[PDB]
Amino acid sequence: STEYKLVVVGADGVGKSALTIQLIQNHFVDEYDPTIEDSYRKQVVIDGETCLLDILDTAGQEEYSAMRDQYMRTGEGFLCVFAINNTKSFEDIHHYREQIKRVKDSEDVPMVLVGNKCDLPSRTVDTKQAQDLARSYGIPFIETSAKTRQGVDDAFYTLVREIRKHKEK
Amino acid sequence: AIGGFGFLFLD
Ligand SMILES: Nc1nc2c(ncn2[C@@H]2O[C@H](COP(=O)(O)OP(=O)(O)O)[C@@H](O)[C@H]2O)c(=O)[nH]1
Ligand SMILES: [Mg+2]
Predict the structure, then answer these.
(1) Which domain holds residue A162?
(2) How many structural domains compose chain A?
(3) With a CB-CB cutoff of 8 Å, which residues 38-97 of chain A face chain B?
Protein backbone atom coordinates (compact mmCIF):
# COMPACT_ATOMS: atom_id res chain seq x y z
CA SER A 1 0.00 0.00 0.00
CA THR A 2 0.89 3.75 -0.49
CA GLU A 3 -0.44 6.61 1.71
CA TYR A 4 -2.08 9.81 0.39
CA LYS A 5 -3.29 12.66 2.62
CA LEU A 6 -6.32 14.40 1.09
CA VAL A 7 -8.33 17.33 2.40
CA VAL A 8 -11.93 18.24 1.42
CA VAL A 9 -12.67 21.96 1.68
CA GLY A 10 -15.67 24.07 0.79
CA ALA A 11 -18.54 26.04 2.22
CA ASP A 12 -20.84 24.59 4.90
CA GLY A 13 -23.61 22.56 3.23
CA VAL A 14 -21.87 21.82 -0.11
CA GLY A 15 -21.80 18.07 0.67
CA LYS A 16 -18.22 17.43 1.85
CA SER A 17 -19.37 14.96 4.55
CA ALA A 18 -21.88 13.28 2.22
CA LEU A 19 -19.19 12.87 -0.53
CA THR A 20 -16.67 11.32 1.93
CA ILE A 21 -19.22 8.97 3.56
CA GLN A 22 -20.44 7.91 0.05
CA LEU A 23 -16.80 7.06 -0.86
CA ILE A 24 -15.97 5.28 2.46
CA GLN A 25 -19.22 3.48 3.41
CA ASN A 26 -21.05 3.42 0.00
CA HIS A 27 -24.11 5.16 1.42
CA PHE A 28 -25.75 8.55 1.11
CA VAL A 29 -26.58 10.44 4.34
CA ASP A 30 -29.35 13.06 4.34
CA GLU A 31 -27.93 14.63 7.54
CA TYR A 32 -24.46 14.69 9.02
CA ASP A 33 -23.55 17.17 11.82
CA PRO A 34 -22.09 20.24 9.98
CA THR A 35 -19.72 21.00 12.87
CA ILE A 36 -17.94 17.61 12.88
CA GLU A 37 -14.47 17.52 11.34
CA ASP A 38 -12.93 14.02 11.08
CA SER A 39 -10.44 11.91 9.18
CA TYR A 40 -11.23 8.73 7.21
CA ARG A 41 -9.08 6.01 5.63
CA LYS A 42 -10.29 4.69 2.21
CA GLN A 43 -8.59 1.52 0.99
CA VAL A 44 -8.82 1.29 -2.83
CA VAL A 45 -6.69 0.26 -5.84
CA ILE A 46 -5.79 3.09 -8.23
CA ASP A 47 -3.85 2.37 -11.48
CA GLY A 48 -2.75 -1.00 -10.07
CA GLU A 49 -1.27 0.59 -6.91
CA THR A 50 -2.94 -0.20 -3.55
CA CYS A 51 -3.66 3.24 -2.01
CA LEU A 52 -4.50 4.20 1.58
CA LEU A 53 -6.30 7.54 1.39
CA ASP A 54 -6.49 9.48 4.64
CA ILE A 55 -9.16 12.09 4.06
CA LEU A 56 -9.89 15.10 6.21
CA ASP A 57 -13.54 16.09 5.98
CA THR A 58 -13.38 19.71 7.19
CA ALA A 59 -15.74 21.75 9.40
CA GLY A 60 -15.55 25.25 10.98
CA GLN A 61 -13.12 25.18 13.96
CA GLU A 62 -11.91 28.05 16.19
CA GLU A 63 -9.86 26.14 18.84
CA TYR A 64 -6.58 24.36 17.91
CA SER A 65 -6.99 20.83 16.58
CA ALA A 66 -4.01 18.45 16.42
CA MET A 67 -5.75 16.51 13.60
CA ARG A 68 -6.36 19.67 11.54
CA ASP A 69 -2.77 20.79 12.23
CA GLN A 70 -1.43 17.39 11.04
CA TYR A 71 -3.29 17.84 7.73
CA MET A 72 -2.02 21.46 7.47
CA ARG A 73 1.57 20.01 7.60
CA THR A 74 1.12 16.80 5.60
CA GLY A 75 -1.94 17.31 3.32
CA GLU A 76 -0.87 16.55 -0.26
CA GLY A 77 -4.04 17.27 -2.23
CA PHE A 78 -7.26 19.19 -1.90
CA LEU A 79 -10.78 18.80 -3.21
CA CYS A 80 -12.28 22.31 -3.42
CA VAL A 81 -16.02 21.70 -3.34
CA PHE A 82 -18.93 23.97 -4.20
CA ALA A 83 -22.62 23.07 -4.81
CA ILE A 84 -23.98 23.72 -8.33
CA ASN A 85 -27.19 25.24 -6.79
CA ASN A 86 -25.26 27.68 -4.53
CA THR A 87 -23.47 30.59 -6.25
CA LYS A 88 -22.10 31.73 -2.88
CA SER A 89 -20.20 28.42 -2.40
CA PHE A 90 -18.72 28.86 -5.95
CA GLU A 91 -17.61 32.44 -5.02
CA ASP A 92 -15.68 31.02 -2.02
CA ILE A 93 -13.58 28.70 -4.25
CA HIS A 94 -10.90 31.25 -5.19
CA HIS A 95 -10.41 32.06 -1.49
CA TYR A 96 -9.99 28.33 -0.59
CA ARG A 97 -7.45 28.03 -3.42
CA GLU A 98 -5.42 31.16 -2.47
CA GLN A 99 -5.38 30.00 1.20
CA ILE A 100 -4.18 26.46 0.23
CA LYS A 101 -1.30 27.98 -1.82
CA ARG A 102 -0.25 29.92 1.35
CA VAL A 103 -0.60 26.83 3.61
CA LYS A 104 1.70 24.74 1.42
CA ASP A 105 3.85 27.87 0.55
CA SER A 106 3.54 26.85 -3.09
CA GLU A 107 1.90 27.97 -6.34
CA ASP A 108 1.55 24.29 -7.45
CA VAL A 109 -0.63 22.28 -5.06
CA PRO A 110 -2.52 19.15 -6.27
CA MET A 111 -6.17 20.16 -6.39
CA VAL A 112 -9.49 19.26 -8.07
CA LEU A 113 -12.52 21.56 -8.36
CA VAL A 114 -15.72 19.66 -7.45
CA GLY A 115 -19.22 20.83 -8.36
CA ASN A 116 -21.48 18.78 -6.10
CA LYS A 117 -25.25 18.03 -6.04
CA CYS A 118 -25.32 17.48 -9.85
CA ASP A 119 -28.51 15.36 -9.36
CA LEU A 120 -30.52 18.59 -8.56
CA PRO A 121 -32.45 20.37 -11.34
CA SER A 122 -32.33 24.02 -10.12
CA ARG A 123 -28.72 24.68 -11.27
CA THR A 124 -27.42 28.25 -10.62
CA VAL A 125 -23.66 27.74 -11.20
CA ASP A 126 -22.95 27.09 -14.86
CA THR A 127 -20.70 24.15 -15.80
CA LYS A 128 -18.87 26.52 -18.23
CA GLN A 129 -18.17 29.01 -15.43
CA ALA A 130 -16.64 26.21 -13.29
CA GLN A 131 -14.72 24.67 -16.25
CA ASP A 132 -13.30 28.17 -17.05
CA LEU A 133 -12.19 28.65 -13.42
CA ALA A 134 -10.59 25.17 -13.35
CA ARG A 135 -8.85 25.94 -16.71
CA SER A 136 -7.50 29.24 -15.26
CA TYR A 137 -5.98 27.26 -12.34
CA GLY A 138 -4.66 24.41 -14.52
CA ILE A 139 -6.67 21.86 -12.50
CA PRO A 140 -9.36 19.24 -13.22
CA PHE A 141 -13.07 19.92 -12.67
CA ILE A 142 -15.46 17.11 -11.79
CA GLU A 143 -19.25 17.28 -11.32
CA THR A 144 -20.44 14.94 -8.54
CA SER A 145 -23.52 13.76 -6.67
CA ALA A 146 -22.98 12.24 -3.21
CA LYS A 147 -26.66 11.14 -3.60
CA THR A 148 -26.28 9.00 -6.78
CA ARG A 149 -22.46 8.46 -6.39
CA GLN A 150 -21.89 10.04 -9.89
CA GLY A 151 -18.32 11.36 -10.14
CA VAL A 152 -17.42 10.50 -6.51
CA ASP A 153 -14.71 7.97 -7.35
CA ASP A 154 -13.56 10.24 -10.25
CA ALA A 155 -13.07 13.23 -7.89
CA PHE A 156 -10.92 11.25 -5.39
CA TYR A 157 -9.11 9.12 -8.08
CA THR A 158 -8.24 12.28 -10.06
CA LEU A 159 -6.84 13.96 -6.94
CA VAL A 160 -4.61 10.92 -6.24
CA ARG A 161 -3.47 11.07 -9.93
CA GLU A 162 -2.64 14.81 -9.50
CA ILE A 163 -0.56 14.14 -6.33
CA ARG A 164 1.30 11.32 -8.17
CA LYS A 165 2.14 13.67 -11.09
CA HIS A 166 3.25 16.47 -8.73
CA LYS A 167 5.57 14.00 -6.95
CA GLU A 168 7.11 13.04 -10.34
CA LYS A 169 8.06 16.71 -11.01
CA ALA B 1 -4.28 33.40 10.67
CA ILE B 2 -3.70 32.33 7.07
CA GLY B 3 -6.36 33.90 4.75
CA GLY B 4 -8.33 34.52 2.69
CA PHE B 5 -11.37 32.74 4.23
CA GLY B 6 -11.51 30.11 2.95
CA PHE B 7 -11.17 27.96 6.07
CA LEU B 8 -11.87 29.98 9.23
CA PHE B 9 -9.08 30.41 11.93
CA LEU B 10 -6.38 28.51 9.87
CA ASP B 11 -3.20 29.18 11.88
N1 LIG C 1 -29.38 16.34 -3.59
C2 LIG C 1 -28.17 16.28 -3.00
N3 LIG C 1 -28.04 16.63 -1.72
C4 LIG C 1 -26.77 16.48 -1.27
C5 LIG C 1 -25.67 16.01 -1.96
N6 LIG C 1 -24.55 16.02 -1.15
C7 LIG C 1 -24.98 16.49 0.00
N8 LIG C 1 -26.32 16.79 -0.01
C9 LIG C 1 -27.11 17.38 1.08
O10 LIG C 1 -26.60 18.67 1.36
C11 LIG C 1 -26.65 18.92 2.79
C12 LIG C 1 -25.26 19.21 3.30
O13 LIG C 1 -24.43 18.04 3.11
P14 LIG C 1 -23.17 17.81 4.06
O15 LIG C 1 -22.46 16.61 3.57
O16 LIG C 1 -23.56 17.94 5.48
O17 LIG C 1 -22.27 19.09 3.76
P18 LIG C 1 -20.94 19.68 4.40
O19 LIG C 1 -21.39 20.75 5.37
O20 LIG C 1 -20.13 20.23 3.25
O21 LIG C 1 -20.28 18.50 5.10
C22 LIG C 1 -27.32 17.69 3.41
O23 LIG C 1 -28.72 17.91 3.53
C24 LIG C 1 -27.01 16.59 2.38
O25 LIG C 1 -27.95 15.52 2.40
C26 LIG C 1 -25.84 15.65 -3.34
O27 LIG C 1 -24.96 15.30 -4.14
N28 LIG C 1 -27.14 15.82 -3.77
MG1 LIG D 1 -19.68 18.19 7.04
Answers:
(1) 2-168
(2) 1
(3) 58, 60-62, 72, 92, 95-96
